[PDB]
Amino acid sequence: LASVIPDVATLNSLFNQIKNESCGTSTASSPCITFRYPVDGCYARAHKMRQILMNNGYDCEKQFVYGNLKASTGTCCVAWSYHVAILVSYKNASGVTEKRIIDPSLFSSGPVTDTAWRNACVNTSCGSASVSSYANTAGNVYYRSPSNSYLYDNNLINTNCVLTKFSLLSGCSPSPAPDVSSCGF
Numbered sequence: 001l002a003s004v005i006p007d008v009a010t011l012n013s014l015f016n017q018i019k020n021e022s023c024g025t026s027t028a029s030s031p032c033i034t035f036r037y038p039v040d041g042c043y044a045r046a047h048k049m050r051q052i053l054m055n056n057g058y059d060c061e062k063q064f065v066y067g068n069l070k071a072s073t074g075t076c077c078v079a080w081s082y083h084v085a086i087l088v089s090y091k092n093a094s095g096v097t098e099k100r101i102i103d104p105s106l107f108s109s110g111p112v113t114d115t116a117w118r119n120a121c122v123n124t125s126c127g128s129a130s131v132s133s134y135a136n137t138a139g140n141v142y143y144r145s146p147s148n149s150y151l152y153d154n155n156l157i158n159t160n161c162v163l164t165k166f167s168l169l170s171g172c173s174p175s176p177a178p179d180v181s182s183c184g185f
């Protein structure tokens, strides 16, 4: 298991592998990743992206951002108290380590800097918005509270259950998302 991806070609491959699992595509396996439904389930999307990296022999970090968050899909807005995505480390063309967020719910075309990512979580086309804090964690953290408490989903039982519950959903409705209380760990 490697924390640093060896090159940009591999980072791009991994991005494509993640995008290929998006709900709405012919290419995805069960459960598809519900990037088109940004209302909720970010934690599950992130952990499923991490599973794809691990399938490939890589791990990553999570970045959690907290605040009065607002994001747009291009036709509707969602409001969040937190968001999470995977923060991938890789070696650039001269062997120096760089990091990028992968989050196709906000950036469908490729990896982006964490500063661009956090700014998309405070999108003022959806009204007032601000970041109160952000934190990086090991990838294995499923959720991090603003008080630095961790929860885990090591066998992806919660992840897969939530993704399945949200499988048919798209856009910014329904909001709140349907109940996922019955999904275990």
Ligand code: NA
Pocket (backbone or CB within 6 Å): 039, 040, 041, 042, 043, 082, 083, 084
């Ligand atoms: Na979420």
